[PDB]
Amino acid sequence: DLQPVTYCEPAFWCSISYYELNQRVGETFHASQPSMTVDGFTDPSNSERFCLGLLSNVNRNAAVELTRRHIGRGVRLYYIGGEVFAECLSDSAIFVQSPNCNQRYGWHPATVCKIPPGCNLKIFNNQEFAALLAQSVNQGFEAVYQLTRMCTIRMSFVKGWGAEYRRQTVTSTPCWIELHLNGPLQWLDKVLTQMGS
Amino acid sequence: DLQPVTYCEPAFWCSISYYELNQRVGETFHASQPSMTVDGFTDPSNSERFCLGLLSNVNRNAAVELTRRHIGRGVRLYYIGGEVFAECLSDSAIFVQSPNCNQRYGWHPATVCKIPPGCNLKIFNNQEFAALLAQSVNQGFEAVYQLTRMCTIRMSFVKGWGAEYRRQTVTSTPCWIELHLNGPLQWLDKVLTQMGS
Amino acid sequence: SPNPNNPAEYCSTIPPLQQAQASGALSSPPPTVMVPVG
Amino acid sequence: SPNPNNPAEYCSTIPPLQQAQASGALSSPPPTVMVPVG
């Protein structure tokens, strides 16, 4: 009747996609390690560092490149105990749109917060996630399929977006990225499966 | 291969649910006519008028009732050519969270706009909807199932919510309602069906 | 696109009915979309 | 709940690692949820 579904830490805990406005740029970077960064350095990326200095965009305009200069150290990302932090190493603030964050904190849905330099933020609380997942399960499929939205987090360097904002959508921001928490997604799949037997 | 799915105007084009904060209040009101209102008059509702003056909520607090006094004439709702307007008849502004509106206008997702007294707003453009539906179809199921969110619109009398707001969620507003555009939903179903054969 | 903070940039004092006319929404039959059956 | 406009009300200068400790996130085995198979 009630079969237990456990969260299982993936090999690559998340994948990152870079964007300049509405144009996706570069290839999809996959996170394998516990602590890495997404910067704008002109060095060849690796398992531990997703550099953007080397990404070309034939349609890149002055605004994009100018901003691309300020990513710098970028953001350090950490995965631990299914918890995910984002530390703004950059000298320019970063902005995050995490459904999980907006869930707690009771913020309006879709909000984007600012993670200024020297600061970090737990963009994903796997526990809080399990709690919802738990609760959700008991509301059927749709309820659960809804949490998939939480496994996707978007972040933009230097410039932010959102309501109260000049730039209303992520797509209007100079330099941003989208991550996908595989841990949660896998776990969300497994769950639906067990519900879909 | 490509089978045409047409929108079909429902008997009851939408259903309305009233809420006082996080508590649902009263029964679900079903819209059958082209032009009606949702007011706070202490008269018995009917096919053409969803009065709220008579709704009791044992947990109603001073704030709710006080605000409930200002709904007044409320909002006049119109359905026509699958188009849906909301006219603030009330002397207190009303606030709307329409995914369809946020789609055009390019506003940030989840935004809530203000429809001040004497004004109206096309909260739902069925055409614009068809255009997305059309486009969506060609992106698979998920893409389409996503438009279901657009068939649900929320509105609060007198007090508004959202980012830049004191009240971050609809659930923290004194008096609100949620409608469900059956026309679109049916049409969205039919579509998924044809995709799910 | 209009500022969501200025109703004036997106609302109207024109009767809804009067609007649906000068846009051919009534004379307009229900829309259709072709969907690949799969 | 913290104001989304004040990072100070929700961010931290405490190393992420140092945080995950004083909350038992590492020592914490992966969570489980019971789901009705239907």
UniProtKB/Swiss-Prot annotation, chains A, B:
Impact after mutating K190R: No effect on acetylation. Completely abolishes acetylation and 97% reduction in transcriptional activity
Subcellular location per the Swiss-Prot or TrEMBL entry: Cytoplasm; Nucleus
Chain positions found as N6-acetyllysine: K159
Mutagenesis or variant effect for K159R: Greatly reduced acetylation and 85% reduction in transcriptional activity. Completely abolishes acetylation and 97% reduction in transcriptional activity
Modified-residue entries (Phosphoserine), positions: S197
Domain text: The MH1 domain is required for DNA binding. Also binds zinc ions which are necessary for the DNA binding. The MH2 domain is required for both homomeric and heteromeric interactions and for transcriptional regulation. Sufficient for nuclear import.
Function: Receptor-regulated SMAD (R-SMAD) that is an intracellular signal transducer and transcriptional modulator activated by TGF-beta (transforming growth factor) and activin type 1 receptor kinases. Binds the TRE element in the promoter region of many genes that are regulated by TGF-beta and, on formation of the SMAD3/SMAD4 complex, activates transcription. Also can form a SMAD3/SMAD4/JUN/FOS complex at the AP-1/SMAD site to regulate TGF-beta-mediated transcription.
Protein name per its UniProtKB record: Mothers against decapentaplegic homolog 3
Protein's organism: Homo sapiens (Human)
Lineage: Eukaryota, Metazoa, Chordata, Craniata, Vertebrata
Curated annotation (Swiss-Prot), chains C, D:
Signal sequence, start to end: none
Effect of V33E: Diminishes complex formation with SMAD2
Listed result of changing Q21A: No effect on complex formation with SMAD2
Record note on quaternary structure: Interacts (via the SBD region) with SMAD2; the interaction recruits SMAD2 to the TGF-beta receptor and is disrupted by phosphorylation of SMAD2 upon TGF-beta receptor activation. Interacts with SMAD3. Interacts with TGFBR1 and TGFBR2; the interaction recruits SMAD2 to the TGF-beta receptor. Interacts with PML.
Domain remark from Swiss-Prot or TrEMBL: The SMAD binding domain (SBD) interacts with the MH2 domains of SMAD2 or SMAD3.
Main function: Early endosomal protein that functions to recruit SMAD2/SMAD3 to intracellular membranes and to the TGF-beta receptor. Plays a significant role in TGF-mediated signaling by regulating the subcellular location of SMAD2 and SMAD3 and modulating the transcriptional activity of the SMAD3/SMAD4 complex. Possibly associated with TGF-beta receptor internalization.
Protein name: Zinc finger FYVE domain-containing protein 9
Lineage start: Eukaryota, Metazoa, Chordata, Craniata, Vertebrata
Gene name per UniProt: ZFYVE9
Entire protein: shown range: 773 to 810 of 1425
